[PDB]
Amino acid sequence: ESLVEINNVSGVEGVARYRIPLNVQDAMDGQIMAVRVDPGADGPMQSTLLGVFTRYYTQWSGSLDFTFMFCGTFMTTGKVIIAYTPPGGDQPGSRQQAMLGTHVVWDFGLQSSITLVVPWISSGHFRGTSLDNTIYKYRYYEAGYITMWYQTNMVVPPNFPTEASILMFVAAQPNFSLRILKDRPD
Amino acid sequence: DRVAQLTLGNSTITTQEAANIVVAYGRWPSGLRDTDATAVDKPTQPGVSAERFYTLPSVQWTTSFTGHYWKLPDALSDLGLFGQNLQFHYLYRGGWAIHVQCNATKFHQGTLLVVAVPEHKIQAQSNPSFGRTNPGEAGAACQFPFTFEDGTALGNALIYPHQWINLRTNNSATLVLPYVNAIPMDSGIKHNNWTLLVIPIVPLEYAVGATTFVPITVTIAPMCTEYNGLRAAVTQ
Amino acid sequence: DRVAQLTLGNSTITTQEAANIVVAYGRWPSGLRDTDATAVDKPTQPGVSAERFYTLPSVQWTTSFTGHYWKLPDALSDLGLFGQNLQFHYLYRGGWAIHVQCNATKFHQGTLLVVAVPEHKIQAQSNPSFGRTNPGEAGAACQFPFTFEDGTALGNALIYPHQWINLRTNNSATLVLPYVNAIPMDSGIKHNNWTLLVIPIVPLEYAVGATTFVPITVTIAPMCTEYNGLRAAVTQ
Amino acid sequence: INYYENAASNSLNKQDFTQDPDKFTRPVADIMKEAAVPLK
Amino acid sequence: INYYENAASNSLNKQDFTQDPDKFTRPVADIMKEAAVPLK
Amino acid sequence: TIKNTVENTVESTHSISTEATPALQAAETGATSNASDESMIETRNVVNTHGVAETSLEGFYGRAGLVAMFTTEGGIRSWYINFGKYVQLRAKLELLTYARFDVEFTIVAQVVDEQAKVKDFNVDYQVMYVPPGASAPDGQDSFQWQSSCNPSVISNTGLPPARVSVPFMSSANAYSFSYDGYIQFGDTSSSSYGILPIHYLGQLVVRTCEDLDSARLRVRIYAKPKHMRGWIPRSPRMRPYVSRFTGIYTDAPSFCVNRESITTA
Amino acid sequence: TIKNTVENTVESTHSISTEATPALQAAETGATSNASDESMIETRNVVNTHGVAETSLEGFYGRAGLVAMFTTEGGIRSWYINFGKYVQLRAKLELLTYARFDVEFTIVAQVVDEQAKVKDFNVDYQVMYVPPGASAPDGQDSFQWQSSCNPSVISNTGLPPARVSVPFMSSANAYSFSYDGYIQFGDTSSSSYGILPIHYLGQLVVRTCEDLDSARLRVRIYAKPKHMRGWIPRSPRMRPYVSRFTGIYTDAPSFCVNRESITTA
Ligand SMILES: CCCCCCCCCCCCC/C=C\[C@H](O)[C@H](N)CO
Ligand SMILES: CCCCCCCCCCCCC/C=C\[C@H](O)[C@H](N)CO
Ligand SMILES: [K+]
Ligand SMILES: [K+]
Known part of the structure; x- marks a missing residue:
């Protein structure tokens, strides 16, 4: 496992780019984050161990392991839902649309962490690592999205910190493999 | 034990503060x-x-909360391929x-049945309205919880x-609920076999300044399903 | 023999002027x-x-008829539970x-391939239009039958x-057609595996005063089907 | 004898036979013998 | 067959297997089974 | 069942009967005729030893043909790997729907003046293979030419031609010479139709290792398939090609030459 | 235990229980997750035959890459043997802490004018290897070029490229791509830090056997590791190199590209 650079937005710099925010809500069913699952693609995954070795090769196959850890106080509670959406359109726009695909419900307690497995659902035996559309039309190989929503709410005692952080880990599963070595563009 | 994991099709649920699992009338679905x-x-x-x-939209446990209900299979009649199979078959x-x-x-302190x-x-x-009798995936409020909406004591539920x-x-x-009826199969659009009811019997209270907004969330799976009499799609 | 009966699910077809049945590349679906x-x-x-x-809408064999085609599974993509299963799955x-x-x-005298x-x-x-490439359940006319719409001789079809x-x-x-592709499964909404073409090679003629209005009718069944990758419903 | 590691290195195949063409020439569900009439 | 005297002369190795990764992935003193909770 | 020669012929006598009718047929059924020679005339014995090997897939496909021909501009050029520019090998591969094969590539190079007149001058050249998502060199002296991960071949215009084998490299279980579909979801544009991105495997890039004065490289590439397998024979192409990446064509009212009348041979 | 293919997949049914909880984990312990696919969803049987050979050390490391490129000045030049000048092979070797390997070196040479324009002219060249404590030649005609103890290779710009193997030559039991220490006792100077003198094995020196008129040699060297062994994988390099002999770098506030918001893919 290695950490994902998930909070990659303009005003966010250094170690702060590894944290996902949570906070106490005043309305229902809201969205926490989204990302494309494609491991060789430019974006949050590209700096990870799994990302750097995938950028040494042209083709990939196998299941992925995504794992999340909660870093609030002992007294903080909540539940969240994490979903994988296979290819065919845009990212799902609501919690009803997301929960029709592969998903988990996570309850924060003693065991700090949870795994979602993104299983290999593909037409062919392998996919391309780039998704670059200007020459080879390789957007053909796009692999789907992962998204996170509130199931209930984050709840705290009086005078506590009303904002908390999650950390996100990615790794390959034992059916994973790579073909055709090429020069790392970084 | 207090931990649990439920897995069905492409879906999984976990919990860390469970209290066993009930299996109604000592029977599993068949x-x-x-x-x-x-x-x-x-x-x-x-x-x-x-x-x-499937996960239905959430309900807030307000100061004035008297209770809420859902009808099965009405609530899931327009969701996914459970919904489409139920519309296409008699x-x-x-x-x-x-x-x-x-x-x-x-x-926080409080209690729900x-x-x-x-x-x-x-x-x-x-004369019950169609809205009150088949409220869909949003469910509807209890207006008469003490008489359990039906002319019986709440205490004997x-x-x-x-x-x-x-x-x-x-x-x-x-x-976990098995199929119950006086016949072997039935119309999904004209008859509801089960109702799920959630009623506060001790109201929600907390230490001054604690988080006030507290949702309740319902998640449901069909289990051991079969259909007969295929035709065009039909709804009430 | 010249009589035949085909039975699939709740449906049956009969004919009294058949000419055997073809099974493509010597394989049944599997x-x-x-x-x-x-x-x-x-x-x-x-x-x-x-x-x-399933039965698609009919086509008239007019004086000017050059030919007609259908794409599979495009033609059945919005019909019954074949349609709904294909939209819900990757x-x-x-x-x-x-x-x-x-x-x-x-x-009457005439001949169709x-x-x-x-x-x-x-x-x-x-630059083929989306209308010409995916014409739905109505199908579309052949504008270039002699070159088989693709730059080959009609005679070698x-x-x-x-x-x-x-x-x-x-x-x-x-x-009767089995599944053909370079991969084990594929997207139903982005790729058509088969085309069904109907082309007149000897034109329709008749004794003076005979019935002039003569339809052609196409009836199709899916066979040995499976789906993977469930999500929300998606269409082109 | 093969001198290299991967099979893409090897020389051309020498198994130059033909086979019965009935999968393309007579792909019909019921048999129609030479001496008989086809439609009966 | 090797034509030269010293092993630095020889061609590349052909033993291209993998092995169990637990020395890097799970290097812990006490075992934690898949179906159980980790901390107890 | 498998055969190494064509069919023999047996003796046949006269027949007068109601019971056996091999000449009558019904083309409507979709089957090709089964009348044998011996059924239709009186025949003699012939032991026929003609072989069948020149018409095997290895027989028909197993020989080299031209795929690319270009010159360098400012000491560099690149080529998208695709067999569409030269029609002879293109027209042969489109006789099958799906095929698997290895390829043997041969490279022939020489020096020319600015008037495209050949020059007796020996120079070092380099060819680099750049898969999709890798950075291609910008010019003759860019630092992508270190070639530490990407494969290269280096050679000289005065040695014999360069040659390498390549295995079956698709993500699919076969290459495809027809594809009735679109490149990606939510893009039904007419330029997105009938291309499979899965056959696209990248570029070749060529340079001279050092700067020539006034002269340029001219380069030709030949490809030969090996170990062919093939499925679902197609109708052969019968109109001119127009474009490198599409099957587009123009119509015309005949395929063979005309004659004065149907009764005059 | 050793494997030649990736893992298969078995069938899996629904589960409703308190007794088995594979989705719950504790990242605090330092272990990576052990949830299998079959535990998390209902699966089908798949016999998976994909191999693992392209990602072996021999697979990843076993191909040639550029290490040196220079021209002669007054008929001579020398090179300190060290893989730091060209970053592509440098960035691959720093994925391991310690390695043992043999090396196959390839030398490519040609004649140029004073304007760095190539020349069609064949000449004899000599390469000499000079270990530490041996005297290097001063110029094109010095008497150290007798080469009676030091190894040499002699060749011509019109033959194919020169090539030799070399065995594992360190005084240590492995080479080192990281070294947290100083060169010698009583010298904590900042220029004495993070160099191991044990990887330094000497120079190569190059000459033309005879004096060219106006022209110079240009020379390139490629290196290929063979028989790799490796210990203790490192985090990969993520900032530009600055210097040939040190790991020095400049900081920056991100590694990947930015986006408009965390909720937009
Ligand atoms: C240094 C030597 C260069 C070798 C580069 C090898 C790249 C792999 C090429 C494989 C051949 C692909 C053929 C596949 C399909 C055809 O291109 C079709 N005409 C596509 O429409
Ligand atoms: C006549 C042919 C010349 C051959 C000369 C051979 C000298 C031996 C070279 C062995 C290779 C040494 C590699 C060791 C470490 C690397 O240089 C590292 N980058 C040092 O930081
Ligand atoms: K014979
Ligand atoms: K295996």
Whole structure:
């Protein structure tokens, strides 16, 4: 496992780019984050161990392991839902649309962490690592999205910190493999 | 034990403050037998496309909260391939897995009864509306919780399958229901076999300044399903 | 023999002027093997709800008739529970049974070629429109039958699976097709595996005063189907 | 004898036979013998 | 067959297997089974 | 069942009967005729030893043909790997729907003046293979030419031609010479139709290792398939090609030459 | 235990229980997750035959890459043997802490004018290897070029490229791509830090055997590791190199590209 650079937005710099925010809500069913699952693609995954070795090769196959850890106080509670959406359109726009695909419900307690497995659902035996559309039309190989929503709410005692952080880990599963070595563009 | 994991089709649920699992009338869901069957055409059994968890929109436990309910299979009649199979066929049969979630700190107190009732009619009024009798996936409010909406004492609801969520002890409730009727199969659009009711019996209170906004969330799976009599799609 | 009866799910077809049945490349439709499979989730196999005859709207054999075509599975993408299963899933695989009907008296003469072609592209024009490439359940007219819409001679189409309807001999044609592709499964909404083409090679003529209005009718069944990768419903 | 590691290195195949063409020439469900009439 | 005297002369190795990764992935003193909870 | 020669012929006598009718047929059924020679005339014995090997897939496909021909501009050029520019090998591969094969590539190079007149001058050249998502060199002296991960071949215009084998490299279980579909979801544009991105495997890039004065390289590439397998024979192409990446064509009213009348041979 | 293919997949049914909880984990312990696919969803049987050979050390490391490129000045030049000048092979070797390997070196040479324009002219060249403590030649005609103890290779710009193997030559039991220490006792100077003198094995020196008129040699060297062994994988390099002999770098506030918001893919 290695950490994902998930909070990659303009005003966010250094170690702060590894944290996902949570906070106490005043309305229902809201969205926490989204990302494309494609491991060789430019974006949050590209700096990870799994990302750097995938950028040494042209083709990939196998299941992925995504794992999340909660870093609030002992007294903080909540539940969240994490979903994988296979290819065919845009990212799902609501919690009803997301929960029709592969998903988990996570309850924060003693065991700090949870795994979602993104299983290999593909037409062919392998996919391309780039998704670059200007020459080879390789957007053909796009692999789907992962998204996170509130199931209930984050709840705290009086005078506590009303904002908390999650950390996100990615790794390959034992059916994973790579073909055709090429020069790392970084 | 207090930990649990439920897995159906492409879906999984976890909890860390459970209180066992109830299996209604000591029976799990099961198939229709050759001695008990009547319709002669070959049934459809969709498998993992129908038999998986769906999550309904959430409800807030307000100051004024009297309670809320859902009808099965009405609530899931327009969701996914459970919905489409139910519209295209004349007859349906099947059981349910149900999981209710509500979390709050060690600085909160309150208690909910979570109860599944067979053949529950709404009858505080001369003529129930279609809105009150089939409220869809949003559900509807209890206006008469003490008489259980039906002219019986609330206190005697524990003859039906139930659990409690007591905020000092647990944060979730789990029920498994088999198919119940006086016939082997029935219309999905004209008759509701079960109702799921959630009623506060001790009101929500907390240490001054604690988080006030507390949702309740319902997640449901069809289980052991079969359909007969295919035609065009039809709805009420 | 010249009589036949085809039965699938809740549907049956009969004919009294057949000419045997073709089974393409000597293969019947079949399931995906464990050695050849790649997607790891458990597939959906709907059975009798998808695998049954559907009838498309009819076409008139006019004086000016050059020919007509259909794309599979495009033509059935919005019909019944075949349609709904194909929209809800990322991947699809399966074969087909096809039956073409056209009847006329002993006072009429004419001949149609009925041919199923794998991976057929439309290319008489620099940039085919979406209407011409995916014409739905109504199908679309042949504008270039002599070059078979693709830059080959019409005369050499008999390398693909085919029959003739010759009005002095028969009134129906029947083809059975297995799944063909370079991969084990594929998207139903982005790629069409087969095209069904109907082309007049001897024009329709008759004794003076005979019935002039003569329809052609196409009836199609999915066969041995499976789906993977469930999500929300998606269309082109 | 093969001098290199991967099979793409090897020389052309020498198994130059033909086979029965009935999968393309007579792909019909019921048999029609030479001496008989086809439609009966 | 090797034509030269010293092993630095020889061609590339052909033993291209993998092995169990637990020395890097799970290097812990007490075992934690898949079906159990980790901390107890 | 498998055969190494064509069919023999047996003796046949006269027949007068109602019971056996091999000449009558029904083309409507979709089957090709089964009348044998011996059924239709009186025949003699012939032991026929003609072989069948020149018409095997290895027989028909197993020989080299031209795929690319270009010159350098400012000491560099690149080529998208695709067999569409030269029609003879293109027209042969489109006789099958799906095929698997290995390829043997041969490279022939020489020096020319600015008037395209050949020059007796020996120079070092480099060819680099750049898969999709790798950075291609910008010019003759860019630092992508280190070639530490990407494969290269280096050679000289005065040695014999360069040659390498390549295995079956698709993500699919076969290449495809027809594809009735679109490149990606939510893009039904007419330029997105009938291309499979899965056959696209990248570029070749060529340079001279050092700067020539006034002269340029001219380069030709030949490809030969090996170990062919093939499925689902197609109708052969019968109109001119127009474009490298599409099957587009123009119509015309005949295929063979005309004659004065149907009764005059 | 050793494997030649990736893991298969088995069938899996639904589960409703308190007794088995594979989705719950504790990242605090330092272990990576052990949830299998079959535990998390209902699966089908798949016999998976994909191999693992392209990602072996021999697979990843076993191909040639550029290490040196220079021209002669007054008929001579020398090179300190060290893989730091060209970053592509440098960035691959720093994925391991310690390695043992043999090396196959390839030398490519040609004649240029004073304007760095190539010349069609064949000449004899000599390469000499000079270990530490041996005297290097001063110029094109010095008497150290007798080469009676030091190894040499002699060749011509019109033959194919020169090539030699070399064995594992360190005084240590492995080479080191990281070294947290100083060169010698009583010298904590900042220029004495993070160099191991044990990887330094000497120079190569190059000449033309005879004096060219106006022209110069240009020379390139490629290196290929063979028989790799490796210990203790490192985090990969993520900032530009600055210097040949040190790991010095400049900081920056991100590694990947930015986006408009965390909720937009
Ligand atoms: C240094 C030597 C260069 C070798 C580069 C090898 C790249 C792999 C080429 C494989 C051949 C692909 C053929 C596949 C399909 C055809 O291009 C079709 N005409 C596509 O429409
Ligand atoms: C005549 C042929 C010349 C051959 C000369 C051979 C000298 C031995 C070279 C062995 C290779 C040494 C590699 C060791 C470490 C690397 O240089 C590292 N980058 C040092 O930081
Ligand atoms: K013979
Ligand atoms: K295996």
